[PDB]
């Protein structure tokens, strides 16, 4: 039993809800919140910009030190950093950004990072401003993640479409 509430259950392990991920994490304080990151950990917009704003830019300051030490992530890769005031940890995961010409096949690799964590709050990878088809991202999530994932969907019209179209 966990404290996630109001989710629709899609499979044995994937749950979904219409929610603002910033407000969800603040309420639940999950062990792991997933950020929709880029390889530079520059948290400018979309989920990333919103999560960073909620930390009063502490996420960005931590991220800049991480990059200065380690260099950029790989597309499809991840790193674990602090969750600041939102969660114990933030798993920064880089899904392909179609608006940059990145290979959509890397979306499965990106979701594989979730399997290193028993329970996660997360957005749909490569959705929103990353330019991929969200119905596709949900399908890859369900077919790749085996741990317990609670998916927050910002857009109301999008959430209803994912549920109604889910197989
Ligand atoms: O796939 C990531 C989605 C994409 C959106 C853009 C259009 C339809 O869905 N973004 C977010 N999902 C959940 N919480 C969020 N908080 C801030 C942004 C955000
Ligand atoms: Cl977005």
């Amino acid at each position: 039993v966990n404290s996630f509430s109001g989710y629709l259950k899609l499979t044995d392990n994937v749950y979904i809800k219409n929610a603002d991920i910033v407000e969800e994490a603040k309420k639940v304080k999950p062990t792991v919140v997933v950020n929709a990151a880029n390889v530079y950990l520059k948290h400018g917009g979309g989920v990333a910009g919103a999560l960073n704003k909620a930390t009063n830019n502490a996420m960005q300051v931590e991220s800049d030190d991480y990059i200065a030490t380690n260099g950029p992530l790989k597309v499809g890769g991840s790193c674990v950093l602090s969750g600041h005031n939102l969660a114990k940890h933030c798993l920064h995961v880089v899904g392909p950004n179609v608006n940059k010409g990145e290979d959509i096949q890397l979306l499965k690799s990106a979701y594989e990072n979730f399997n290193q964590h028993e329970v996660l709050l997360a957005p749909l990878l490569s959705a929103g401003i990353f330019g991929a088809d969200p119905i596709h991202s949900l399908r890859v999530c369900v077919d790749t993640v085996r741990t317990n994932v609670y998916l927050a969907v910002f857009d109301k019209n999008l959430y209803d479409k994912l549920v109604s179209s889910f197989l």
Side-chain angles (χ1 to χ4, degrees):
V1 181
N2 60 51
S3 58
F4 287 105
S5 177
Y7 287 79
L8 182 68
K9 181 171 178 62
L10 294 176
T11 66
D12 171 76
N13 65 298
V14 181
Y15 297 79
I16 194 168
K17 177 183 180 180
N18 169 231
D20 181 337
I21 194 174
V22 170
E23 293 310 311
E24 273 288 284
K26 281 194 287 185
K27 180 72 173 184
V28 176
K29 311 224 200 305
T31 305
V32 181
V33 66
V34 174
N35 182 31
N38 60 52
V39 300
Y40 305 111
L41 301 180
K42 286 312 191 201
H43 306 302
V47 167
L51 291 174
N52 177 63
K53 179 182 179 183
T55 75
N56 184 43
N57 210 51
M59 177 180 288
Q60 190 65 65
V61 172
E62 179 195 31
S63 292
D64 287 352
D65 171 83
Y66 173 92
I67 297 285
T69 297
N70 301 106
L73 296 180
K74 302 169 176 174
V75 180
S78 71
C79 68
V80 180
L81 292 172
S82 177
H84 300 278
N85 51 316
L86 304 176
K88 187 167 194 284
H89 307 284
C90 178
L91 180 69
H92 295 272
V93 181
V94 184
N97 190 324
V98 171
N99 300 319
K100 303 181 178 174
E102 286 160 4
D103 188 4
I104 195 59
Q105 309 299 308
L106 292 169
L107 186 55
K108 187 174 184 72
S109 300
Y111 274 118
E112 290 172 341
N113 295 288
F114 289 24
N115 288 323
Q116 301 294 318
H117 303 276
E118 287 203 322
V119 181
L120 316 86
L121 172 60
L124 284 169
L125 298 178
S126 298
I129 70 175
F130 282 64
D133 177 356
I135 294 174
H136 179 63
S137 180
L138 179 55
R139 187 76 258 166
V140 178
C141 182
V142 162
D143 296 339
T144 305
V145 182
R146 298 176 302 282
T147 55
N148 292 326
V149 56
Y150 291 85
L151 290 168
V153 177
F154 189 94
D155 189 303
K156 167 54 150 173
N157 259 36
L158 174 57
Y159 169 80
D160 286 347
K161 183 188 179 189
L162 293 160
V163 168
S164 293
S165 55
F166 185 78
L167 187 51

